[PDB]
Design an enzyme around this catalytic site. Structure first.
Site, PDB file in Angstrom:
ATOM      1  N   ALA A  16      34.853  41.081  35.113  1.00  0.00           N
ATOM      2  CA  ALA A  16      34.252  41.108  33.870  1.00  0.00           C
ATOM      3  C   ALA A  16      35.527  41.098  32.753  1.00  0.00           C
ATOM      4  CB  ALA A  16      33.250  42.195  33.473  1.00  0.00           C
ATOM      5  N   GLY A  54      38.042  43.271  33.408  1.00  0.00           N
ATOM      6  CA  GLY A  54      38.559  44.806  33.239  1.00  0.00           C
ATOM      7  C   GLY A  54      39.963  45.064  33.304  1.00  0.00           C
ATOM      8  N   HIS A 103      33.905  49.907  38.791  1.00  0.00           N
ATOM      9  CA  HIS A 103      32.682  48.868  38.691  1.00  0.00           C
ATOM     10  C   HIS A 103      31.543  49.749  39.458  1.00  0.00           C
ATOM     11  CE1 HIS A 103      36.078  46.184  38.072  1.00  0.00           C
ATOM     12  NE2 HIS A 103      36.431  46.563  39.129  1.00  0.00           N
ATOM     13  N   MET A 121      34.836  32.190  43.503  1.00  0.00           N
ATOM     14  CA  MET A 121      35.424  31.155  44.379  1.00  0.00           C
ATOM     15  C   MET A 121      37.012  31.120  43.866  1.00  0.00           C
ATOM     16  SD  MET A 121      32.205  28.871  43.050  1.00  0.00           S
ATOM     17  CE  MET A 121      30.478  28.995  43.502  1.00  0.00           C
ATOM     18  N   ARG A 122      37.193  31.368  42.418  1.00  0.00           N
ATOM     19  CA  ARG A 122      38.430  30.963  41.922  1.00  0.00           C
ATOM     20  C   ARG A 122      39.531  31.898  42.603  1.00  0.00           C
ATOM     21  N   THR A 142      48.049  38.744  28.089  1.00  0.00           N
ATOM     22  CA  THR A 142      47.801  37.482  27.635  1.00  0.00           C
ATOM     23  C   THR A 142      47.523  36.587  28.953  1.00  0.00           C
ATOM     24  OG1 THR A 142      49.523  37.542  26.049  1.00  0.00           O
ATOM     25  CG2 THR A 142      49.039  35.191  26.743  1.00  0.00           C
TER      26      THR A 142
END
Lengths: 241, 241
Positions: free
Chosen positions: B11, B13, B65, B98-99, B189
């Site tokens: 999410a 975090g 989490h 998946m990433r 960033t």
């Protein structure tokens, strides 16, 4: 009353939790989850966000590789009555690490020998070194569990006489009569164990000789071994000279 | 007073804990351990056998989490004052899985859609499904933290206006003035983050579009999405229609 099966990683803790389960269960156990059910592993519980209640009013058995001084154990300071501390020849733990993990060895042995254990191994956490671990659960035990009595047992002794060496844990843990012991020793086996692991992996389910390389290592291991450093102390004591 | 940064896995975090740290730190942070230091991750602490004291007398920030109802959190029942609940478009969490994790997708999506989250994914534990997680930390929160106020923030809103959306977390968490916010937004960033991760891995140290496949999936995701099932409820609410 809270009871720990405490052990350095690879001290044969799965094998012992197998036996203690199938004795308390009565039935043989095939599935590895069946063992986590009988003697749950604190690290595993915590990974799920489970933590067993402090001050159970009936006896609970929990296993762990944590140092007795880990802060997460402080919740159990007063409720801990007993500790079974399972010990193994450290030299074997190395082999056990390679066994599951020749340039590859003559340096892991250096790290192990510099570690005095598995501190560099990311597989486990909170275990300290081999002697820090044994101390915390034996001679320094009241520093973190002041109501506790301790019984130490060696992997080496459990293998040369599985029946008798177990009854001692059973009796110590006041788990009942001497009768179940053989049939309980029976379903756990350096073979039947290997098999139980297998089924469980396959179904999905959650699971799990020195000089052959040395020469140069040997002179360093034996220096650690006979060298007035807490490791050697605990090697001297549990017969690994 | 105990404060949680709560979030379903992926999410965003890490990104948020980056910012909250370099704001409290003041200095920019490069090393990932520097973040675990600023906003420690409960799961990580527990893996070591650390557990932060219940009833700190100064404010502590912890991230997790876990579902708010996990028993290990019960130690913090009364001492919890605040919760920042960070939320993301669930569809993105799949891609994020998946990433980091085309036959491979049209079925993980089925498991995710059957899961209503990541319950089958062994990477995390204790997180429940996406809506069970959001509920536990938002509308059902007092069932496990009765003294707590909650502020929800969307990954989607933090990306379109990082400065303002952060100040809200800061102000809510009463961490100080609105002034550090930009320089704190600055060192974290979608690039500088990727870089920080890199250094830390390299040194050793501990670290870390829909239809392009679908067609058949889409009609099932959108059925879950607009379908009177708590997932859809929370999708309806945080603007993922």
């Amino acid at each position: 009353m809270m009871c720990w099966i405490a052990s350095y990683p690879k001290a044969g803790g799965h094998w012992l939790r197998c036996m203690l389960t199938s004795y308390v269960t009565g039935e043989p156990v095939e599935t590895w989850p069946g063992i986590q059910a009988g003697v749950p592993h604190l690290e595993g519980l915590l990974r799920d966000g489970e933590a067993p209640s402090a001050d159970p009013d009936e006896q609970v058995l929990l296993a762990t590789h944590f140092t007795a001084d880990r802060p997460v154990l402080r919740f159990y300071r007063e409720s801990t009555a007993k500790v079974v501390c399972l010990i193994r020849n450290p030299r074997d733990a190395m082999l056990s690490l390679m066994r599951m993990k020749v340039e590859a060895c003559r340096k892991i042995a250096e790290t192990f020998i510099a570690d005095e254990g598995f501190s560099s191994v990311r597989i486990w956490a909170g275990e300290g070194s081999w002697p820090e671990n044994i101390r915390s659960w034996t001679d320094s035990v009241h520093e973190s569990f002041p109501n506790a009595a301790v019984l130490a047992v060696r992997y080496e002794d459990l293998r040369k006489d599985p029946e008798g060496e177990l009854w001692k844990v059973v009796d110590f843990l006041e788990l009942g009569g001497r009768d179940g012991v053989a049939d309980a020793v029976a379903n756990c086996t350096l073979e039947r164990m290997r098999e139980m692991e297998e089924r469980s992996k396959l179904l999905g389910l959650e699971t799990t000789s020195l000089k052959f390389m040395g020469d140069d290592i040997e002179k360093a291991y034996a220096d650690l071994l006979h060298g007035e450093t807490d490791f050697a102390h605990y090697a001297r004591l549990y017969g690994y000279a």
